[PDB]
Write a protein that binds this DNA or RNA. Structure first.
Lengths: 333, 333, 333, 333
DNA sequence: AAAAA
DNA sequence: AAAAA
DNA sequence: AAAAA
DNA sequence: AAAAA
């Protein structure tokens, strides 16, 4: 049995598996992997999988394969390889991808209902912010999934440009990251959740940068607004990266306590080395100005240590901004 | 085939498509758009759409048309025009409105399950806070959808008044905005979410104003309470508008940092111009009073700069109120 | 046709409609209300309602009636009266109660899927924290629904006591209020949501008081712990009531601003009347100590106004605790 | 009728009921408990339960029993005992476990849709973070369920180690606790929710400790990083335990107020005893330094009470960190 | 909100 | 985003 | 997590 | 909470 090659592969030039020279026909699989461990140019229909309560597919190297239909029955893909595979036009229910590798494969126009991706590798994968639906899905490695995807730009036709494709893919990734995080609120390990928070913050700021770059490329008012937007996105990248690196992205109060103690110790050492204060109260002055409740007792304009005191207060204010949300997260769920 | 014209069009005077002189009969469509690009006075039944996995409806100008039934099969409306169209008494599942224009069309008594409205224009549309159900719907342009709707008041009968209709539509829009935001928590781009936050805050405050105006119009205790409620809603409009304009409605920490820096710079310039302070520590005094930790070192009642110092402290307090929730939002998801 | 009277009515002495002398048989309704506007001792089965897409039941006075089955078809109850009615053993889907009155009626062992109660009156109704399921339900008047319910205690058998029944009903109401609030996050008007917040806070604290009273009634260590728990619940009742009355239960920043301004004005008037300070800077001292950033400039132990200054600072601290969550709610959704 | 013993019992050595010497065959139950109150080595299929709207199973002592299938019909287990029972390969819908005891029983590969566990005892139970699905489940005793589970280690084969099994079970419990909390947001009593918050915080920190211990056991850079991670997890355990014990894990503002008042009173008593300050303003100095707004009026480096004042300020700062989230929780839902 | 496949 | 079982 | 109606 | 289509 054979079936027509899909327009997603042969016409949609934005797709990772796009091949204008793809064969007109694909073999229709009977889902028998005993004879061939690597299927090629094959269509895997949900109506043709064997009658089983759980189908375990193990160590199969898929290349240039298509999936189609409503996969209601449970499937376990164990250490499978997908290369230029199209999962589009399919609805998987409770499908488990365990240790699988995805290369140049597309998840656009796909529904993954209550599925799981665990210990998977992604490179040059593709998804859609609205047409890659992941209801109750568990992506155990959110950062690798999100940033293992990238827009394919070698088949961009004339009249369209590479840069807009990439910079709109940034927003696409931001949107799907929002969806993935909302999934992970119910589900997954703490580490998976916090990796997802990291990924979604980074993707949101990258999308802001990309949209500002678009507005710049595309009248002087628009150029000024795009430049200001780009600077603003750059600045928010920097601050958010510093804060999340310093507090584990809202996970660990202990790390924030430790950076606070390190900063206080450094300021106290500077007090002791430069202004001849004994350590046992240079530490006290440092923690007194750091937490800002004892600032006015030591700050006097025109004094030698005034700039140092003001810097210590600013460090304390930044540390407050870092530390308060960690406590809020650990105490409010 | 023909069907009776619906009471929603011929009797419900609150509906946008209400026409007491509407024809008694509507033509029943066979959903063939090859011959006629604009259908008129036509009923589109979900039971009569052609057998297709996805029906693409492109460049069709609907006017005075009704939809009815359970549209389970996927429909894509591409650049269609709906004028005085009734979507009521229908349940659409995974319907995509792409680039469509809605004029004087009603979404009351409608269910939109997992639907999408993208790049759409709305004007004089109508919806219901409880009978326009949008489960998992994605409205890509929340502000335009919400504020493109307005109560129809030309057919209000005697004994009812225009003002109450409009001012209860304000609360209606607030309720549906709440629903739309709850949808967008799972879904959509960051920009769509933040536009929805803007729209729902504005709609909530407009509904408060409208209900206060009703309580005024409808005994001296009630008038006093309505007037106080109206002033309170006005005041909350003003503060919420200022704060959300100043922080991107809880989106961008960088903008709040920039307004803080601008305010500090202005106060420091005033210090330098008026009280002869060098810039390199007029800036320091300004940031010292702005963040409030160095207020008492410079504030003295009866001094020339005392009012300026007090204003700088008040500006800093407002800036704290502006900036803290932005950090909370960017660090807590 | 006739059916056996249910054990919920004749045996379950905790139910509001409990009647040990109830007739052995109930008439089985054919759902024809044209002849009789008030049905009595009648069983309304979901399998026997007439074939209709939406059944409108208007101005029907139900008394001692039972409902049973899966009411999949839409029902609209318009201005109906339910007296000692059992909705138990039923699953209603998209049922609308509009302007209905419930007296001594039970919602235990009932599922209300996507239902709506609007403009309804409740008195002596009954529900269960776990067996009254309200998935996606909209209760437009949460406070009246929750506090219109109360445990029936006249049929408590020997060996059980009235007090435990009532004080465990307090926890029951708290649990169902939690469920109702979680519903209203997606849905309903702002006013309904904030009334639900009020109701659920009050119910949680009443349940704490009731459980402490139980632990007291039911060894000296247990009595001490119950007494301490009761005092703690009393104290949290008081503070939560004051804060929510002062800020609209987290709704309106303007009201909190206004109580802040009133308190500052009162303290400033006291300054001006007692310590001879001109108003134009008694106001400034009051706002300087209220926001706590200028406290140490005016506070000196042993001074005449020291107690007043300390009170002004305490008022400011309480006002901070009142006002910060209102800003958080209005800026973070 | 008889059926083959499942590989979960005879092969999966990580399961609590694992018995390599289990009989090859299990009796297939007809679900008649009138004759035998304790079934042994019996398979309970969902297809073979008697035709009933609600099946009440009361006072049945199950031992070495298996459940299998889609239990769509409602089941009430009342005071039943499960010993080495496998609920795996089953999907229960609206199953109520009331007063049941679970010993060495497994919930892996199980779906519990809208189920309820009330007044149950758990010891040596087993579950999976991803394969124990609890959609809309209500676990009335979250702490006992979560910490009544533990990895079975006596059947660990050669080449695998006990320690890794236990320390990965810690993360497993953390993940399922996250799921249980997300369930309890919609549902259950306040006490159940707050017990779940306690359990999930403790489990998250235990999992952090366990993963750090793994990274230590499994090059000097990795050892240093594991040791630092272990110290960080220890520290966060300590702080989170202190804060949640001091504020009821975000439940009760009154308890936080009371610890604040106790600390202030202790510091004031120390002032009065050591530095001869009258009580009526030793209390005022204590509350003035505790809330930090009056710190600089009393703090002077080199004074006798300077260390005490600094300690009082630190106590106040910790109390702020304790108390603010309680107010946030009680005012923001 | 009403209306009512 | 597009596409379209 | 594994396992696999 | 109990109860039990």
């Amino acid at each position: 049995p054979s079936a027509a090659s899909r327009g997603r592969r042969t016409k949609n030039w934005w797709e990772p598996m796009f091949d204008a020279n793809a064969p007109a026909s694909f073999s229709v699989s009977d889902w028998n992997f005993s004879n061939n461990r690597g299927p090629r140019c094959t269509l895997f229909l949900a109506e043709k999988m064997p009658d089983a309560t759980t189908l375990v597919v193990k160590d199969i190297d898929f290349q240039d394969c298509d999936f189609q239909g409503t996969f209601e029955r449970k499937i376990v893909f164990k250490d499978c390889k997908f290369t230029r595979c199209d999962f589009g036009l399919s609805t998987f229910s409770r499908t488990k991808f365990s240790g699988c590798s995805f290369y140049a494969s597309s998840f656009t126009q796909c529904t993954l209902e209550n599925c799981e991706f665990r210990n998977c590798k992604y490179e040059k994968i593709f998804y859609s912010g609205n047409e890659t639906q992941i209801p109750r899905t568990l992506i155990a490695e959110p950062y690798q999934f999100l940033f293992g995807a990238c827009a394919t730009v070698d088949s961009v036709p004339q009249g369209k440009s590479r840069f807009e494709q990439r910079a709109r893919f940034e927003e696409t990734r931001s949107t799907i990251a929002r969806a993935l995080l909302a999934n992970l609120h119910s589900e997954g390990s703490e580490d998976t959740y916090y990796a997802a928070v990291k990924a979604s913050t980074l993707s949101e700021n990258r999308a802001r940068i990309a949209r500002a770059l678009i507005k710049i490329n595309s009248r002087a008012v628009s150029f000024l607004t795009g430049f200001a937007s780009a600077i603003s996105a750059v600045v928010g990248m920097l601050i958010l990266l510093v804060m999340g690196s310093l507090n584990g992205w809202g996970s660990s109060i202990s790390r924030a306590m430790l950076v606070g103690v390190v900063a206080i110790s450094c300021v106290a050492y500077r007090y002791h080395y430069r202004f001849n204060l004994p350590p046992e109260d240079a530490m006290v002055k440092a923690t007194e100005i750091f937490f800002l409740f004892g600032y006015t007792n030591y700050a006097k304009m025109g004094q030698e240590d005034f700039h140092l005191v003001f810097s210590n207060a600013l460090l304390g204010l930044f540390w407050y901004a870092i530390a308060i949300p960690t406590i809020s997260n650990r105490l409010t769920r």
